[PDB]
């Protein structure tokens, strides 16, 4: 099993060759009179590497007293985009290659969903379990101060992002550290770091967002008639059967939203055990069972599944919090029509080739897991604006709606109101509840869904343009590479 | 033919006398107990001059190698407004008076359309044709660095604007130079310079905007019944006949939009030649003919016009990219009912007096050519916000519209739905396309049209207030002078 | 042959063990009541690593046009000292370990001679010969801009230093780049980079200084009676015979100053060839012969030396611009009484052990090659002061001297001047020339000699304290480690 990093480098090279074969044909050819093959190759070679990587060896004092050094790597992929986003990870055995490849992946993920951010990644070689909470807080504070003195962390340059390992308390600590080290003089200093708690300007519904994104992404490919016909199944709006690997938060939200949309979860797969039901599993009952018991096994009115969850005859299979569980041997054996990646690199490229051979759709992880990035971008914008979304406009919109309804009322009474009185002023119960229950979370949901729909449409158009019938991952990579090429090409280079 | 600069100074003096005769009567009289004639005269004398003018003599190295100096003049008219906008021009024979008068004109143009910007102008004494692209890039970079070291260019102080001579590539170079010289640390540094390409945060539809503005401006005066009655022609919404001088981009967009609105272009005038048709000329066919041939002469189903395009019996005459083509002798000879200025100073003040004598409407250029300024201001705001307009609200608005339609559906089924089913949920085909095709360009168009309508209404009110029946240019100048007077008078002076 | 970097790490560990065995005994024991062995070990572990290392992958455009990336590594060892000095090297096959070990060596070298600077090193993976002068200038400018945006280069943080590969033209380019990128607003911005040309505030006599330092260092050990008696030779002020390996600038200045001091150079060794004379070689004649011919072979009144220059029966042997020419086998064979290192790592640690066995003195390179660092520090101070040294005081001092002489004159005439007139007012011819020829170069020479004498005295005291009879290198390393320990230990740690 090759590392994820050679995986990313190969994906970039594969997309780069295809996009280079096309750019020199249509626009780069008229861009300059001289030969453009070398010019585009040079642009691609400039795009490939990560611009900045820095290593910090900073002392810390343990609770008992050790005075030992901690090594932390910060990688900023590029400064084409000035504001960058970078997740922070506290894990043993991190490398400089770790953060370089993750920064490249992050900048491409921001590119595909049209989020104006560069890619970055911070990795601290430490085991969070071994060290106490106070020691972890001191490590975070020291790392933040050292990173700030070097001019990396900051609203203008780089915004931290919460990885699965890091909680929001760490980011409250990071925000306090930045406020102390650099100062709260600037207005934009409030938007220094994302992932903040709600009282600190934090966006609402952030935890569900990633899972929510998955629920949208699959939807955007289910609605398409062409791909569903190519696969050979009818579009499964409500009759689709899906199973999920693992019980992560993203998987939980995804299965809840799929059940709300009408889909049925015939089985749930997890490392500890698998649960099988003839028709479906209740998301709320399963969630309560998991929160109390701690394991999905033993669910009432359910029989544990025997075998491999990947090989089940489901319409959709969603691997979540999984790394290379579906191997080269697994791909021919599985009969799932659609594989939707909820985690990073759930499948091998050889398995992808096998899927292309057997005409099993793979939906790229890069498009799916960008909901959290989009919502973090929205939260950054909210922190910059310093206003809850729609605060000044909710009553204005509802007054406009009521006035429109009253206008329809008066017009109907004027024309057809000679006998009796017409009452169109009454709103729909769902619409009335939405008007009364209007909040910023609705705006965030609408923006996330709109961004996901646009990204899916652009991915489909790119796949059609380059004749990638089923290799959606390559199409997404080509789209990201084309966008980055464009920004760099027309941006002046000193 | 007097220079445009004595023209501007005389316009300012003419407006200043009229506004001074009025301010001391109504509000300045109660403002202070003592004599106010001298106080208002002092305010006007302070308003008149340009605050700052700076000359740079900076070395450049030619491709062959010459080591020769370049002289560049930067004029900021005033700092009453902190953010200023200033166009950059690369032309031989520029002067300090050049940039002073152009800065005064720019600040007045920003004032009339309620754009919160001061006036500025940069002029570099050089011939762009003689020097190669690399030499021009080096000149731009050196000029930008020298201007930045003196603290003129910057989001807070002064934002460059694209003149007809300068392309967007020069402004990409200027943005890169500013990012290098001062740094990308600030968030607002992204909004340092307007006119950026779309990938860099550039506004969409900028090229058409100026022409679009013309199409709106004339409209805002066609709809008015009082002025049309005074002229003596019926309001020509669709039966108006218009001709244009030159084939500039502004003229092209103006004639296309006029044809879409229903107006007919009986003839097209250009320096190379003129084309005459009995009824109209197709904008798309003429545009294709011009792009291929390079000259409008020889258009299919058209006969070249013999004589002077200015003297044609058109309802509307639009000079574009023209300087004093309509002289004192021309004004009595022309029979066009309306002259709409698409360029700076197309007509002489003596010709304006003759037009007032013969009751031929002149629509001031200051109000017409401000569409580009307004759109540049919108793009600056977008760069500050770092968000495409309406991104978070499009789906919310369309969901609200669908909910309103469904509410009307349910109410109609409740009242008149005893027999059959009513279907008001279906939107208009045009409305449905607009909902599906919603984008930022629509918002920019709406904002530009709203600003132009407001400016036209204020100009009409000012003209009525000061008894300027047909001298709309003087009314616009008086309005701008009054606005500037107000900002300065009630702002504290150290 | 082990790398120089394992050499430095082993030297640091060897010194650290010895200094740790002593600190816990005398001062650290009273510093804190609890156990101090672990405390001192922790301090040493914090001291060892380099705090910051950053890698830049920046694009450049070749003259033909290639658009290819350049990798450059910057290592700052620590910030215990805020102003750091770092040499810049343009050489193929540089590594991050390269710059880390060189930064550690530089900070220790600054520590031994009491120069308040931290250690740093910049290494660019490129071949200067392949690229043209314009390409090299562009590489330097791009590297400087990228390093400045990250807040490394600057008077407060890090000052560049000229390596043997880099000329002063590169540093003029670097100074211009820093002035453009950050700005000349600050007074201290003049002192951003050392190694400047004289017109730019550059110190005089910088080129000779390193060689001059060698001439002082050996002197400071020749004058000592104890070490010379231990070796078993009489102190050779004028009868000493010395030979030099290579014909570097440091070697040239060293041999010229030794000849002026009265020493005789019986033979000169170089890679191309060796020249042998019974008594001595004229430095000026040899310098002219080398500048014209390009090789020392064929010198008039000289016979080429046959054999190995290292094995010659000289009193002093000075390797210059040499790397591990004296190996383990060489050490027993050589009969030179004193080996004075003019370059970095001329000898292996095994050869050092053999020298200790055979009681042949080795004078550490760290103490010898610090003259250039000291003079660069003096030049930095001059740039900060913005005044040539002694400008306001030369005439004052000479007036004071003349007044003292006249006072002695008058007193002698009062007491012994009854008969005749006494003339003590006349100064010594050498003293009169020095008074007339007073300049800043004399002050720089005096400061360099004073610093070298103090460093030699401290090294001797440290060697006596720790019972290192002949291992002067270990004594110097222990002294540097003790100084760094002190600064860190008594400085507060967050």
UniProtKB/Swiss-Prot annotation, chains A, B, C:
Location of ADP-ribosylcysteine modifications: 110
Modified residues (N6-(2-hydroxyisobutyryl)lysine): 85
Keyword hit for Transit peptide: yes
Function comment: Mitochondrial glutamate dehydrogenase that catalyzes the conversion of L-glutamate into alpha-ketoglutarate. Plays a key role in glutamine anaplerosis by producing alpha-ketoglutarate, an important intermediate in the tricarboxylic acid cycle. Plays a role in insulin homeostasis. May be involved in learning and memory reactions by increasing the turnover of the excitatory neurotransmitter glutamate.
Identification of the protein by name: Glutamate dehydrogenase 1, mitochondrial
Positions bound to NAD(+): 79-81, 114, 190, 382
Modified residue annotations for N6-succinyllysine: 6, 22, 48, 100, 121, 129, 138, 284, 290, 301, 303, 328, 353, 395, 415, 418, 441, 465, 483
Originating organism: Homo sapiens (Human)
Active-site residues, Swiss-Prot/TrEMBL: 121
Modified residues (N6-acetyllysine): 22, 48, 100, 109, 121, 125, 129, 149, 264, 284, 290, 301, 303, 324, 328, 337, 353, 395, 415, 418, 441, 465, 483, 486
PTM comment, free text: ADP-ribosylated by SIRT4, leading to inactivate glutamate dehydrogenase activity. Stoichiometry shows that ADP-ribosylation occurs in one subunit per catalytically active homohexamer.
């Amino acid at each position: 099993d090759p590392n994820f990093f050679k995986m990313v480098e190969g994906f970039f090279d594969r997309g780069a060759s295809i996009v280079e074969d096309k750019l020199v044909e249509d626009l780069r050819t008229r861009e300059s009179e001289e030969q453009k093959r070398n010019r585009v190759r040079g642009i691609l070679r400039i795009i490939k590497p990560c611009n900045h990587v820095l290593s910090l060896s900073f002392p810390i004092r343990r609770d008992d007293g050790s005075w030992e050094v901690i090594e932390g790597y910060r990688a900023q992929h590029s400064q084409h985009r000035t504001p960058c986003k970078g997740g922070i990870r506290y894990s043993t055995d991190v490398s400089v290659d770790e953060v370089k490849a993750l920064a490249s992946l992050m900048t491409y993920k921001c590119a595909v969903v049209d989020v104006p951010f560069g890619g970055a990644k911070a990795g601290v070689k430490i085991n969070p379990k071994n060290y106490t909470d106070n020691e972890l807080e001191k490590i975070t504070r020291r790392f933040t101060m050292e990173l700030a003195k070097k001019g990396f962390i900051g609203p203008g340059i780089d915004v931290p992002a919460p990885d699965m390992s890091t909680g929001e308390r760490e980011m409250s600590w990071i925000a306090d550290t930045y406020a102390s080290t650099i100062g709260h003089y600037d207005i934009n200093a409030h938007a220094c770091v994302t992932g903040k708690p709600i009282s600190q300007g934090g966006i609402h519904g952030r935890i569900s967002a990633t899972g929510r994104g998955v629920f949208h992404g699959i939807e955007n490919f289910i609605n398409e008639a062409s791909y569903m016909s190519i696969l050979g199944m009818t579009p499964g709006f409500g009759d689709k059967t899906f199973v999920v690997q693992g019980f992560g938060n993203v998987g939980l939200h995804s299965m809840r939203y799929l059940h709300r949309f009408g889909a049925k979860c015939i089985a749930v797969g997890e490392s500890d055990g698998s649960i099988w039901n003839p028709d479906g599993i209740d998301p709320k009952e399963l969630e309560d069972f998991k929160l109390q018991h701690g394991s999905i096994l033993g669910f009432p009115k359910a029989k544990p599944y025997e075998g491999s969850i990947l090989e089940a005859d489901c319409d959709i299979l969603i691997p979540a919090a999984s790394e290379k569980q579906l191997t080269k041997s697994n791909a021919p054996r599985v009969k799932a029509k659609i594989i939707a990646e909820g985690a990073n690199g759930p499948t091998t490229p050889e398995a992808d080739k096998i899927f292309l051979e057997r005409n099993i759709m793979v939906i790229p992880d890069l498009y799916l897991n960008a909901g959290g990035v989009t919502v973090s971008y929205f939260e950054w914008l909210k922190n910059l604006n310093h206003v809850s979304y729609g605060r000044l406009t909710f009553k204005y919109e509802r007054d406009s709606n009521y006035h429109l309804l009253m206008s329809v009322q008066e017009s109907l009474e004027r024309k057809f109101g000679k006998h009796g009185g017409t009452i169109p002023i009454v709103p729909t119960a769902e619409f009335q509840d939405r008007i009364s229950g209007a909040s910023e979370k609705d705006i965030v949901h609408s923006g996330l869904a709109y961004t996901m729909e646009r990204s899916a449409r652009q991915i489909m158009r790119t796949a059609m343009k380059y004749n990638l019938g089923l290799d959606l991952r390559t199409a997404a990579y080509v789209n990201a590479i084309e966008k980055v090429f464009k920004v760099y090409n027309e941006a002046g280079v000193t």
